[PDB]
Design an enzyme around this catalytic site. Structure first.
Site, PDB file in Angstrom:
ATOM      1  CG  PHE B  64      89.473  91.042  48.549  1.00 30.09           C
ATOM      2  CD1 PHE B  64      89.573  89.530  49.055  1.00 30.09           C
ATOM      3  CD2 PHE B  64      88.150  91.517  48.543  1.00 30.09           C
ATOM      4  CE1 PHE B  64      88.294  89.154  49.584  1.00 30.09           C
ATOM      5  CE2 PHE B  64      87.084  91.001  49.178  1.00 30.09           C
ATOM      6  CZ  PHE B  64      87.169  89.871  49.557  1.00 30.09           C
ATOM      7  CD  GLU B 239      99.385  89.505  60.480  1.00 28.76           C
ATOM      8  OE1 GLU B 239     100.201  90.165  60.810  1.00 28.76           O
ATOM      9  OE2 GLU B 239      99.441  89.138  59.206  1.00 28.76           O
TER      10      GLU B 239
HETATM   11  O1  LIG Z   1      94.870  98.982  47.970  1.00 30.98           O
HETATM   12  C1  LIG Z   1      94.814  97.603  48.217  1.00 30.98           C
HETATM   13  C2  LIG Z   1      95.377  97.370  49.333  1.00 30.98           C
HETATM   14  C3  LIG Z   1      95.084  95.978  49.658  1.00 30.98           C
HETATM   15  N1  LIG Z   1      94.412  95.037  48.806  1.00 30.98           N
HETATM   16  C4  LIG Z   1      94.185  93.681  49.360  1.00 30.98           C
HETATM   17  O2  LIG Z   1      94.553  93.395  50.639  1.00 30.98           O
HETATM   18  C5  LIG Z   1      95.530  92.349  50.671  1.00 30.98           C
HETATM   19  C6  LIG Z   1      96.443  92.882  52.069  1.00 30.98           C
HETATM   20  O3  LIG Z   1      97.302  94.155  51.660  1.00 30.98           O
HETATM   21  P1  LIG Z   1      98.582  93.989  51.484  1.00 30.98           P
HETATM   22  O4  LIG Z   1      99.214  95.297  51.015  1.00 30.98           O
HETATM   23  O5  LIG Z   1      99.148  92.749  50.853  1.00 30.98           O
HETATM   24  O6  LIG Z   1      99.274  93.919  53.066  1.00 30.98           O
HETATM   25  P2  LIG Z   1     100.715  93.301  53.531  1.00 30.98           P
HETATM   26  O7  LIG Z   1     101.303  94.286  54.152  1.00 30.98           O
HETATM   27  O8  LIG Z   1     101.388  92.744  52.404  1.00 30.98           O
HETATM   28  O9  LIG Z   1     100.277  92.117  54.260  1.00 30.98           O
HETATM   29  C7  LIG Z   1      99.888  92.317  55.826  1.00 30.98           C
HETATM   30  O10 LIG Z   1      98.634  93.130  55.692  1.00 30.98           O
HETATM   31  C8  LIG Z   1      97.378  92.116  55.368  1.00 30.98           C
HETATM   32  C9  LIG Z   1      96.417  93.210  55.148  1.00 30.98           C
HETATM   33  O11 LIG Z   1      96.051  93.583  56.855  1.00 30.98           O
HETATM   34  C10 LIG Z   1      97.427  90.978  55.842  1.00 30.98           C
HETATM   35  O12 LIG Z   1      96.531  89.889  55.188  1.00 30.98           O
HETATM   36  C11 LIG Z   1      98.930  90.193  55.906  1.00 30.98           C
HETATM   37  O13 LIG Z   1      98.986  88.897  56.899  1.00 30.98           O
HETATM   38  C12 LIG Z   1      99.726  91.318  56.699  1.00 30.98           C
HETATM   39  O14 LIG Z   1     101.196  90.593  56.604  1.00 30.98           O
HETATM   40  C13 LIG Z   1      96.404  92.644  49.313  1.00 30.98           C
HETATM   41  O15 LIG Z   1      97.157  91.502  48.948  1.00 30.98           O
HETATM   42  C14 LIG Z   1      95.073  92.825  48.199  1.00 30.98           C
HETATM   43  O16 LIG Z   1      94.570  91.416  48.213  1.00 30.98           O
HETATM   44  C15 LIG Z   1      93.923  95.558  47.790  1.00 30.98           C
HETATM   45  O17 LIG Z   1      93.476  94.742  46.906  1.00 30.98           O
HETATM   46  N2  LIG Z   1      93.975  96.746  47.229  1.00 30.98           N
END
Ligand SMILES: O=c1ccn([C@@H]2O[C@H](COP(=O)(O)OP(=O)(O)O[C@H]3O[C@H](CO)[C@@H](O)[C@H](O)[C@H]3O)[C@@H](O)[C@H]2O)c(=O)[nH]1
Ligand SMILES: O=c1ccn([C@@H]2O[C@H](COP(=O)(O)OP(=O)(O)O[C@H]3O[C@H](CO)[C@@H](O)[C@H](O)[C@H]3O)[C@@H](O)[C@H]2O)c(=O)[nH]1
Ligand SMILES: CCCCCCCCO[C@@H]1O[C@H](CO)[C@H](O)C[C@H]1O[C@@H]1O[C@@H](C)[C@@H](O)[C@@H](O)[C@@H]1O
Ligand SMILES: CCCCCCCCO[C@@H]1O[C@H](CO)[C@H](O)C[C@H]1O[C@@H]1O[C@@H](C)[C@@H](O)[C@@H](O)[C@@H]1O
Ligand SMILES: [Mn+2]
Ligand SMILES: [Mn+2]
Lengths: 282, 282
Positions: B64, B239
């Site tokens: 995504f 998660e």
């Molecule tokens: O504006 C946004 C925000 C999120 N994402 C997607 O959602 C993923 C998750 O968001 P991200 O900001 O990467 O979250 P993290 O804080 O890095 O990761 C935490 O949050 C994620 C979402 O809850 C979980 O998948 C992970 O395990 C957890 O460590 C992103 O990589 C994207 O693929 C978007 O495309 N646009």
């Protein structure tokens, strides 16, 4: 059932697995194709029992008792009742030329025994397993195929169940592959050259899902027929063919020699925490 | 294909696995429910590649990239081409609110990319994965579901494939379960008490067969809807729910933190022989 919708496990309280603490450091517990090698200390039987009971798993156990080997049935079956898949549905299939010589053994609930009469002539078990194909598909989820001149001394349970398993031969688990007594004549269907082989599996204990066991037994029977037509008999008969099959079709679990041991011959080495299924003299 | 007739492996020359030599003695390589934990040194990738190519395996990868996160796609995809399932059939599914912002990335043979437009609103990925159900069943054998703010640095291949997998969170693999940041409020569907839990899995990398991934994503979406209706949001969102699901539905493999690492935060500890898939700043 196999492969069907799996309901949620209930809450369970058990020791946390710790990533930086291995269960066993003295033995290989996973093959290079990512199949577990089943040793004591590698499994929580409470979790596994839950998983398999929630599928209402039925295990078939095949055993041949032909000619004088009917004498081994009483101990085999009575000890199976104490140790084999207790709590699960079990169907024993006893193949014999002497139905009247099968001992009357008292079974626990949810367990049944069928006596199947065969002709008296080790190598033709593959054919009989592959006459029973329809029966087994209708009646059990997994098949376990063993020798009769054996007794259960400790737990043998659902930790073994998987699509296809073999068991490490107790005499060869420490051997290098060139020492394995595979069939070495290129004229045999069972031929394995000196630079091939993962393990030496014993013909006395193999199993899997009904589908995979039928595939194995069909393939081994066909290979044995080819050898017969070509005037060659593999050095260790059905076991040679089983080894060829499991080289080319990797098992999804491998049982340690806990599951096939000869204490008279080999004692009780440190690597064995339990002796589960053992040779009886003769 | 999954679960279909498996042809024989060809002859292969490779090092013999030795029963009395463990691959890794510093880490747990199998869970107490007999699922491999995938670390470097536990698998022979040549055997696994043979097994999966003989099934003509197709792997779908979902990612995504919504709002500003489209900026992460170029590195994500270009490094996936270098390291993800090379030699196998791959179908990327890029979900975005900005189809025009998807970079034009050159793909190796047998690999394809589909751009799927979605609405811009992390927690709704479960719903979208569970709109695509029919598409995925028709097009791929396995699904791998990952975060986009990542890059591949080393091999990520068929060693991960299995009916259901999760990945150990890099911050918690050495932690005791009471320290895990599970949802602890009994009012949430994601609730796990302090005496339960095997591992803390990261939401950023999970997968399995299409059927199992659809079951997981459906269950998590339903649980998240219940929480929404009850006015509660789990502490770590999707998660938290993924952790609840994998507690109650044990994964059939667990990926080590080689497969989800943050080098800026956590360095390169001795237990990691390879850093395969790693966080990018932001
Ligand atoms: O504006 C946004 C925000 C999120 N994402 C997607 O959602 C993923 C998750 O968001 P991200 O900001 O990467 O979250 P993290 O804080 O890095 O990761 C935490 O949050 C994620 C979402 O809850 C979980 O998948 C992970 O395990 C957890 O460590 C992103 O990589 C994207 O693929 C978007 O495309 N646009
Ligand atoms: O007269 C016989 C001879 C054999 N059997 C059956 O066949 C099995 C195998 O024969 P057995 O004498 O036990 O062979 P072993 O020498 O103990 O075992 C070797 O030979 C078997 C047959 O090739 C393989 O299953 C084993 O792995 C291999 O170690 C027996 O247990 C019985 O179930 C009979 O029922 N009647
Ligand atoms: C005295 C017999 C010594 C047997 C040692 C090796 O075991 C034998 O291995 C053969 C393959 O090389 C084949 O599997 C037969 C197997 O012998 C059987 O299994 C042993 C463990 C003993 O129980 C033996 O009595 C039995 O015949
Ligand atoms: C500075 C941030 C420290 C984050 C340490 C712990 O990781 C966080 O763990 C949460 C569950 O307790 C949840 O999974 C988010 C996760 O943070 C993500 O993953 C880390 C490894 C970092 O890459 C971090 O930047 C990212 O937000
Ligand atoms: Mn015997
Ligand atoms: Mn992220």
């Amino acid at each position: 059932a196999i492969g069907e919708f799996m309901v949620s496990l209930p809450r369970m309280v058990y020791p946390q697995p710790k990533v930086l603490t291995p269960c066993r450091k003295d033995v290989l517990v996973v093959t290079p194709w990512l199949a577990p090698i089943v040793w004591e200390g590698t499994f929580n039987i409470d979790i596994l029992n839950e998983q398999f009971r929630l599928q209402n798993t039925t295990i078939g156990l095949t055993v041949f008792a032909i000619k004088k080997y009917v004498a081994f049935l009483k101990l085999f079956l009575e000890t199976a009742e104490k140790h084999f898949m207790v709590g699960h549905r079990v169907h024993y299939y006893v193949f014999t030329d002497q139905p009247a010589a099968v001992p009357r053994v008292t079974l626990g609930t949810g367990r049944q025994l069928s006596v199947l009469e065969v002709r008296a002539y080790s190598m033709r078990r593959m054919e009989m397993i592959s006459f029973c194909e329809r029966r087994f598909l209708s009646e059990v989820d997994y098949l376990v195929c063993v020798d009769v001149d054996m007794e259960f001394r400790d737990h043998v349970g659902v930790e073994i169940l998987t699509p296809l398993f073999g068991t490490l031969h107790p005499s060869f688990y420490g051997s290098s592959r060139e020492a394995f007594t595979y069939e070495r004549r290129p004229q045999s269907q069972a031929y394995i050259p000196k630079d091939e082989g993962d393990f030496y599996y014993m013909g006395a204990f193999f199993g899997g899902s009904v589908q995979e066991v039928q595939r194995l037994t069909r393939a081994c029977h066909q290979a044995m027929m080819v050898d017969q037509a070509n005037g060659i008999e593999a050095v260790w008969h059905d076991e040679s063919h089983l080894n060829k099959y499991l080289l080319r079709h990797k098992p999804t679990k491998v049982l340690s020699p806990e599951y096939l041991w000869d204490q008279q011959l080999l004692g009780w080495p440190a690597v064995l925490r339990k002796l589960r299924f053992t040779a009886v003299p003769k």
